[PDB]
Amino acid sequence: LPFVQLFLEEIGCTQYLDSFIQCNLVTEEEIKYLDKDILIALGVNKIGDRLKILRKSKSFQR
Amino acid sequence: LPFVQLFLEEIGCTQYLDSFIQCNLVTEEEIKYLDKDILIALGVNKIGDRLKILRKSKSFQR
Numbered sequence: 801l802p803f804v805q806l807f808l809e810e811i812g813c814t815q816y817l818d819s820f821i822q823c824n825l826v827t828e829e830e831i832k833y834l835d836k837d838i839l840i841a842l843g844v845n846k847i848g849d850r851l852k853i854l855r856k857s858k859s860f861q862r
Numbered sequence: 863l864p865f866v867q868l869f870l871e872e873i874g875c876t877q878y879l880d881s882f883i884q885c886n887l888v889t890e891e892e893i894k895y896l897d898k899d900i901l902i903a904l905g906v907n908k909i910g911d912r913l914k915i916l917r918k919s920k921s922f923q924r
Contacts, residue, residue, distance in 0.1 A: 836898040837913030845909075851899030 802827040811856040812849075819843040832860030864888045873918040874911065881905040894922030 804826045808816050816825075816839075823842035825831045836854035844850055866888045870878050878887070878901075885904040887893045898916045906912060 835913055835916050837910075837916045840898060840902070840909060840912070847899065847902055847907075850902075851897050854897045854899060 802829070804828065804831060807831070807856070807859070811852060813844075813853065816842070816844060816853070828860050831857040832862075863890070866890065866893060869893075869918070869921070873914055875906075875915060878904070878906060878915075890922050893919045 804820055805817060807828065808814060808820070813820075819842045820826055820831075823834075823838055825834065825839075825842070831853075834857060836850060836857065839853050839857075840850050844853070866882055867876075867879055869890065870876065870882065870887075875882070881904045882888055882893070885892075885896075885900060887896060887901075887904070893915075896919055898912045901912055901915050902909075906915075
């Protein structure tokens with residue numbers, strides 16, 4: 801019962817829900833099993849925060 | 863042994879020398895711990911290849 805929403809809420813990325821669901825980041829693993837260039841492509845050209853998600857994406861260890 | 867040019871040339875980043883040297887990616891480690899946002903911010907907004915560098919970036923171990 802994953803909820804990337806609860807995660808994006810911490811990384812203030814409420815505008816990355818329908819964006820992540822498209823790229824496939826609605827899981828607590830997909831983000832941990834992906835890259836950052838995927839986010840930017842996901843539809844988040846917003847340079848900067850993108851780097852944050854990069855680190856947050858790793859927030860998952862398992 | 864700073865020769866990222868050899869590696870950047872293998873990934874096709876001939877136009878990332880003065881860019882990498884700016885951020886400090888002229889080492890076989892700096893890029894080993896860099897992100898896509900770091901590259902895009904480095905001066906490579908070129909969406910796409912960025913992901914490649916992100917992958918090759920990991921090409922570095924020790």
